[PDB]
Amino acid sequence: GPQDHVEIIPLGGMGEIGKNITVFRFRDEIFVLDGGLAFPEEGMPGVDLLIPRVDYLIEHRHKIKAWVLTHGHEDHIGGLPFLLPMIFGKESPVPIYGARLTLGLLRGKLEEFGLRPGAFNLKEISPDDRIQVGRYFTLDLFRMTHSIPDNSGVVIRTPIGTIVHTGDFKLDPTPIDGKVSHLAKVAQAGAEGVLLLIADATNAERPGYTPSEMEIAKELDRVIGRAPGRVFVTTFASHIHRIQSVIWAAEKYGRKVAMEGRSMLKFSRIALELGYLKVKDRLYTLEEVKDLPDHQVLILATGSQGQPMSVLHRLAFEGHAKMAIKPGDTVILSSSPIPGNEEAVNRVINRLYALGAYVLYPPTYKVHASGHASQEELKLILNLTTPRFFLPWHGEVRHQMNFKWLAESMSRPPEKTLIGENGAVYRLTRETFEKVGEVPHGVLYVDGLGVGDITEEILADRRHMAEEGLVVITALAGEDPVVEVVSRGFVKAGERLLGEVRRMALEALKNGVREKKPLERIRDDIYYPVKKFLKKATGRDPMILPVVIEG
């Protein structure tokens, strides 16, 4: 009755695509689903990656009975190297479940951060395994085709009912590794009755079905076969299926594959070791291939953190240290832009063409296919589960809304669909489902020096300047008061008002001296009036830095 209710607390991945992490709780036992990162879009220079704030988990660490990872994509496990130490410290006994490849990639990262091997309790399971979590949760994972092998959804059985989480998925009828989705557990759950459905909303706006990775492999074979000279291919480091497809295409035309990008080299190494990747010869470095005929070279590349942008941007503008675009090169962008980078990629494409390269990119060219289900696939899942409650996930509000409308057009629509938000606390009972509160939530920014180096504050006033400009007022508080006003990125109309600013500042400074006021109070007497005056006369709110010095 009362004590019977599951709490679902999303800390990332809701209303957005990235840094996925969802907390599940029944009474005093918790388990977490994934812990990803989010890549920063350009315009946020210096930032290497974003991670979810996990205050709630740091506070309730003792109640965490397990951490479950659905697959090895950066936005699902990418944050763990930072989050685990924040929650448990340098070590923990807590079971961290994941498939072979998922944990394989995770260890590569943990190790890379100085985390001792075996410091954390990683339990390798099958993509289709069943695991008991504490006294209240029985998890039945099921394999789903996606853009990385060993990907799962999970049927979450609780004391008050079943929750089906589709995980990230598409229903690829012909996956590159020959491992089709396993829907038995999902259909079965549907027939018994699904209380809540949490499903991938990425392509809820798209009619039809997502093309198979096999279609892309064949199209990649096609365009690479016709390439005159060198071929560059960019994609995420974790897109193992795409990488295999490229490798196959290269090998079909006698090309040797070189690889650039720390993360991708690392992940491919692991995939090769574990058997997920196969290469007839081997993977080379840029140097080892620098002297081969153009027609015999294919380069696979991505950014240092695993995303293509930084390397595409360098090939286009700043210039890359180990490689450079030349007329005749063929560049294939075999991935889609991170949300917020669409038009930054367009500029890269424009610039790449001007360098003389034949650029092939999506959606104009079929050199990429989403790793997520389109409407026909989502409808199949909706009918398979016919959930009482529905919580669209893995997508921005428009994606979530469109999935809601899609669900509402089914034979037996959900009793209710909530639009999930990060930090929201959802209460689920056998008969109800609602948001009952919130917990601290947000994002931490990471760069070469770790977390904290860059902050919301540093970014907030970085925009205040970018959009309004700067006005520096230098005041000398003494018996010989002096005021100097200078500005930057400020409107000319406003600049011509700096003389007036200077004078009203002097009066404030002189008056401040007379009253024997502290400098900070004199700073205020200057700041406020000047701020008011300027907006009242320009409609702009430039950043006003008043510096008052006694002397």
Consult the annotation and say whether 60 binds a ligand: no
Consult the annotation and say whether 441 binds a ligand: no
End-to-end CA distance of the chain: 72
Consult the annotation and say whether 461 binds a ligand: no
- The interface region with a copy of itself, picked from 172-180, 208-216, 235-243, 537-545 by CB under 8 A, is 537-545
Of positions 16, 34, 42, 75, contacts Zn ion by CB under 5 A? 75
HSE, CB side, 13 Å, CA atoms: give it for residue 305. 20
| Dist CA 114 CA 543 (whole Å) | 42
Choice between 238 and 487, CB closer to Zn ion: 238
Helix axes 100-112, 262-274, angle to 10 degrees: 140
519 alpha carbon, distance to own chain's centre: 45
Site membership for a copy of itself, residue 467 (CB under 8 A): yes
Consult the annotation and say whether 71 binds a ligand: yes
Tell me the closest approach of the beta carbon of residue 208 to Zn ion, in angstroms.
Answer: 20
| Dist CA 475 CA 486 (whole Å) | 12
Consult the annotation and say whether 370 binds a ligand: yes
Q: Check if the beta carbon of residue 379 is closer than 8 Å to that of residue 176.
A: no
Q: Which amino acid is located at 234 in the chain?
A: T
Q: Which amino acid is located at 317 in the chain?
A: F
Residue position matching structure tokens 């001296």:
513
Choice between 88 and 236, CB closer to Zn ion: 236
Of positions 42, 168, 213, 329, contacts Zn ion by CB under 5 A? 168
The site partner of 474 among Zn ion, a copy of itself, none (C-beta below 5 to 8 Å per kind) is: a copy of itself
Consult the annotation and say whether 168 binds a ligand: yes
Site membership for a copy of itself, residue 537 (CB under 8 A): no
Tell me the closest approach of the beta carbon of residue 421 to a copy of itself, in angstroms.
Answer: 9
Q: Check if the beta carbon of residue 175 is closer than 8 Å to that of residue 212.
A: yes
| Dist CA 541 CA 122 (whole Å) | 52
Q: Check if the beta carbon of residue 148 is closer than 8 Å to that of residue 238.
A: yes
Torsion angles phi and psi, residue 176, rounded to 5? -60, -25
Cβ contacts of 181 within 8 Å, gap of 6 or more: 142, 143, 144, 145, 169, 171, 172
Consult the annotation and say whether 146 binds a ligand: yes
Residue position matching structure tokens 């020959």:
178
Consult the annotation and say whether 329 binds a ligand: no
Of positions 478, 511, 520, 528, contacts a copy of itself by CB under 8 A? 478
How many residues contact a copy of itself, by CB under 8 A?
60
- The interface region with Zn ion, picked from 160-168, 268-276, 277-285, 411-419 by CB under 5 A, is 160-168
HSE, CB side, 13 Å, CA atoms: give it for residue 318. 9
**Residue 91, burial from CB neighbour count under 10 angstroms (0-12, 13-18, 19+):** middle
Consult the annotation and say whether 221 binds a ligand: no
The site partner of 75 among Zn ion, a copy of itself, none (C-beta below 5 to 8 Å per kind) is: Zn ion
Contact string (CB under 8 A) for a copy of itself, positions 270-309, x = contact: ----------------------------------------
Return the SS3 of 521: helix
Buried b (16+ CB within 10 A) or exposed e, 153-165: bbbbbbebbbbbb
> How many Cβ atoms are within 10 Å of 105's Cβ, its own excluded?
29
Tell me the closest approach of the beta carbon of residue 540 to Zn ion, in angstroms.
Answer: 31
Tell me the closest approach of the beta carbon of residue 381 to a copy of itself, in angstroms.
Answer: 20
The site partner of 478 among Zn ion, a copy of itself, none (C-beta below 5 to 8 Å per kind) is: a copy of itself
Consult the annotation and say whether 478 binds a ligand: no
The sign of the torsion formed by the CA atoms of 150, 151, 157, 162 equals negative
Contact string (CB under 8 A) for a copy of itself, positions 436-465, x = contact: -----------x-x--xxxx--xx-xxx-x
Tell me the closest approach of the beta carbon of residue 523 to a copy of itself, in angstroms.
Answer: 12
| Dist CA 123 CA 111 (whole Å) | 16
Q: Of 525, 522, 520, 486, which is closest to residue 502 (Cα–Cα)?
A: 486
Residues between 342 and 361 that touch a copy of itself (CB under 8 A): 342-343, 346, 349-351, 353-354, 359
Q: Of 301, 372, 300, 370, which is closest to residue 336 (Cα–Cα)?
A: 370
| Dist CA 145 CA 124 (whole Å) | 19
The site partner of 545 among a copy of itself, Zn ion, none (C-beta below 5 to 8 Å per kind) is: a copy of itself
Tell me the closest approach of the beta carbon of residue 364 to a copy of itself, in angstroms.
Answer: 4
Choice between 40 and 494, CB closer to Zn ion: 40
Q: Which two tokens stand for residue 300?
A: 């696979």
Site membership for Zn ion, residue 73 (CB under 5 A): yes
Contact string (CB under 8 A) for a copy of itself, positions 397-436, x = contact: xx--xx----------------x-----------------
Site membership for a copy of itself, residue 524 (CB under 8 A): no
Q: Check if the beta carbon of residue 299 is closer than 8 Å to that of residue 258.
A: yes
Residues between 20 and 49 that touch a copy of itself (CB under 8 A): 43, 45-46
125 alpha carbon, distance to own chain's centre: 25
Tell me the closest approach of the beta carbon of residue 393 to Zn ion, in angstroms.
Answer: 10
For the annotated binding site, the residues are 71, 73, 75-76, 146, 168, 237-239, 368-372, 394
User: Which parts of this chain interact with a copy of itself (CB under 8 A)?
Assistant: 15, 43, 45-46, 205, 339-340, 342-343, 346, 349-351, 353-354, 359, 364, 396-398, 401-402, 419, 447, 449, 452-455, 458-459, 461-463, 465-470, 472, 474, 476, 478, 480, 482, 484, 486, 488-493, 540, 543, 545, 547, 549, 551
User: Which parts of this chain interact with Zn ion (CB under 5 A)?
Assistant: 73, 75, 168
